[PDB]
Design a protein around this ligand. Structure first.
Ligand SMILES: *Cc1c(COP(=O)(O)O)cnc(C)c1O
Ligand SMILES: *Cc1c(COP(=O)(O)O)cnc(C)c1O
Ligand SMILES: [Cl-]
Ligand SMILES: [Cl-]
Lengths: 457, 457
């Protein structure tokens, strides 16, 4: 890539999550990715970067997969697009639906509805929750409960579910009818609480919110098995059962937001099987295709599906569709993705190498004076940098310790993201990462963290 | 296609806009499209159908385009995906942004933000409208005004903008802060009003709504140049200027929803140039890629962009992104699409053959006893069937005249959609349609309408 392209970028391309002015003026320099293979990408300067974030928790089978590119091409040649309205389909979308339900989804899942992004999938979730209760004659039972630091999308309603302020700022979010309970981050639990007591606290807090709101008004609770963008927050021991006990008591649906965790990410089929969650609805995307083509999928459980089915006899077809729902080339990409996941036992690899990565991180970083917590689960991990480790005092956000450490990794040839609203270095590498590659990742992160500690301590 | 596939479809595939139970039980039969070429698709029975709806107003360059399939394949091989966050880009997305602004968008457009569906693009629009007013210190100026029969998406907020009840039913829509003004359908204007007086009426009605709500609370107005899913409602003479005069008077932004009308559909670059609209923000999708890959694009005018740019100096990066924003394969598909549109002068073809189609429809259907109105603009057209043509009395909706006529076309080998909330046969054929093909379309529609008139009159 090329200096004219960068002029045209600054003039006309509005990027996601990009400082509008600094990009436009060149102060935030652009970067063009020209190719990629395995766990590495190549920029316009010829730099090859080790990408320990797999794009955005999404390039799970690794880059450069000619198999998937050929599967997309064959579908694009045969039939790039027709709609899936009024019972229309491609072979590919039918096959994909059966394979998701049969090979990947938890017990009791039935139907799959397709979109393009995780955000449109959670938008679909909110509609299904309202529909379900309206057709069952419970018009007041509508509120959705999310969590502080949850990430669930970047729309109005989906941004409201999101529990990170940057997705609310100047958008007047959260909307009415979305409430937030605690982030279950045990490291930051009230002083004196052991893990069990903190879980007990989290459950009581949720219960009190349901009771304050009126249980007859509360429809669903949404949660990622492990919180991703909110900073790699692993649920404490017994958390999910404690939460599900509260929800069951007041007939609240569970939406498992599996956009990160599904399709081998935590070393399991999805996060729900790993973390003892029994969701009524599931959101997926990212790893569904390994980002080779855009696709999202809402997985509907038998209970909600049966009400949708029976209600349709009275109500006609549900008023829901996106033009590109079931897009054939996106289904073809997904099937090639699932083929590779299965054939190369990548889920088992993510368990093993993810266990290893987390271990090697603890070894390199536990007791490091800049690091307050090392954490993770499967092929997700994080370091959270703190000012006083034992008192759990963070740095002031303006010191930008997290962004600095991310930047220092990038100088040293590795991509690891500085997470929002804190000083946190996140890792979400391709699920095909080797143990050797994991050690490379830890080695570079360690050099980066050491560099920044020198500057800031 | 195949009987096992249909079993798996009924068991596991939740379709957009599909009677859940009747599909699942087989009463609503499924159909698998196995290929397509030109203006025709092929189903699992070998039937070749003339598709006068171009999928969903979207397959604009026609089916079977190996050029686009190869362009997708070449990008999928080189770099299927990386993100476009924090100033990252592909060559393709940069080129696309410059070409949209330079060759297709109206005067005064600057930046392009990418999504996957028209609905996520209007979701982005609502965020930009709220941001704009919040950063300008106008926290009350937030309400959006749409229109009865407008179609703007199938989410919560985007469904609220939509002015068709089927997208509201059991979803508790429209949300607060979305209001609807009149559908400007001159055929159904209050008795006694000539066209000029009706336009005058529509403007006063909008003004009264702004005044009732408080102009300081009203942020934007959204409208399709010609209303698509709402039934091919062409704006009356002087309508758009009358509306823009009201909006300008109270500093209300104009969002042009060009998801149907953009990229040659009305025989012009976009509907805005054709219909004297000067929008602050523009929504696009469908014809942006001719559906070869999913993509949406929000086109931001200089006025709104300049506030976003300057606000970022104080506020940091805007909290907005979708993981697949700028998806490379989708950009590659778009560029091949635009290449073909330009190279084959398809916009000029849409003007000519669309003019012809509308003329031939008027000839075949004006005075037909089942038909209350023939209407259209460019390569969009509709027949609206009525019980009393002069008194403008419709059939009762339960007679399903529209669906019947659609079904009768389909028996005769042609796809033309029965539009929601009325008895309306819609046409939106590929922009590459020939005059001969247009005459085929009119001929089959005429036989279909005659058949249904025999049954119902
Ligand atoms: C990325 C993400 C989403 C939203 O997905 P998009 O494709 O960016 O809309 C939703 N939930 C979780 C947990 C995510 O990580
Ligand atoms: C189809 C359509 C949309 C929504 O597009 P999706 O891709 O289906 O979300 C929005 N506005 C108009 C005018 C449309 O025709
Ligand atoms: Cl495995
Ligand atoms: Cl032309």
């Amino acid at each position: 890539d090329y200096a004219k392209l960068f002029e045209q970028d600054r003039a006309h391309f509005m990027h996601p999550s990009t400082h509008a002015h600094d990009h436009a003026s060149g102060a935030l320099p652009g970067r063009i990715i020209t190719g990629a293979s395995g766990v590495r990408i190549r920029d316009h300067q010829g730099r090859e970067l080790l990408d320990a974030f797999a794009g955005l928790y999404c390039v799970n089978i690794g880059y450069g997969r000619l198999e998937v590119a050929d599967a997309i091409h064959e579908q694009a040649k045969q039939l790039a697009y027709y709609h899936t309205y009024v019972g229309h389909a491609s072979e590919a979308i039918i096959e994909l639906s059966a394979r998701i339900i049969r090979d990947w989804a938890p017990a009791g899942m039935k139907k799959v509805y397709y979109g393009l992004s995780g955000s449109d999938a959670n938008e679909t979730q909110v509609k299904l929750v309202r529909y379900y209760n309206n057709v069952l004659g419970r018009p007041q039972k509508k509120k959705i409960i999310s969590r502080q630091r949850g990430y669930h999308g970047s729309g109005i309603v989906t941004g409201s579910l999101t529990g990170l302020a940057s997705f609310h700022q100047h958008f007047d979010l959260p909307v009415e009818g979305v409430k937030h309970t605690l982030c279950p981050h045990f490291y930051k639990a009230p002083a004196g609480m052991d893990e069990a007591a903190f879980v007990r606290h989290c459950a009581q807090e949720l219960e009190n919110l349901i009771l304050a709101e009126g249980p007859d008004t509360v429809a669903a609770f949404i949660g990622e098995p492990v919180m991703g963008t909110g900073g790699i927050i692993v649920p404490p021991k017994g958390y999910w059962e404690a939460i599900q006990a509260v929800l069951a008591k007041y007939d609240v649906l569970l939406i498992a937001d599996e956009v990160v965790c599904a399709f081998g990410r935590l070393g399991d089929k999805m996060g729900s099987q790993r973390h003892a969650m029994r969701p009524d609805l599931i959101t997926t995307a990212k790893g569904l295709t390994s980002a080779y083509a855009p696709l999202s999928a809402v997985i509907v459980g038998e209970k909600v599906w049966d009400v949708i089915d029976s209600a349709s006899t009275r109500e006609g077809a549900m008023g829901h569709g996106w033009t590109y729902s079931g897009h054939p080339i996106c289904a073809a990409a997904a099937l090639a993705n699932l083929d590779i996941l299965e054939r190369e036992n990548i889920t088992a690899n993510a368990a093993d190498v993810g266990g290893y990565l987390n271990q090697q991180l603890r070894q390199a970083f536990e007791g490091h004076p800049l690091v307050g917590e090392v954490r993770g689960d499967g092929m997700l991990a994080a370091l959270e940098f703190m000012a006083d480790r034992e008192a759990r005092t963070p740095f002031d956000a303006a010191l930008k310790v997290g962004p600095k450490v991310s930047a220092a990794c990038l100088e040293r040839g590795m991509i690891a993201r500085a997470m929002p609203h804190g000083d946190i270095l996140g890792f979400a590498p391709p699920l095909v990462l080797s143990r050797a590659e994991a050690d490379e990742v830890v080695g570079i992160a360690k050099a980066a963290v050491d560099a920044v500690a020198a500057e800031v301590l």
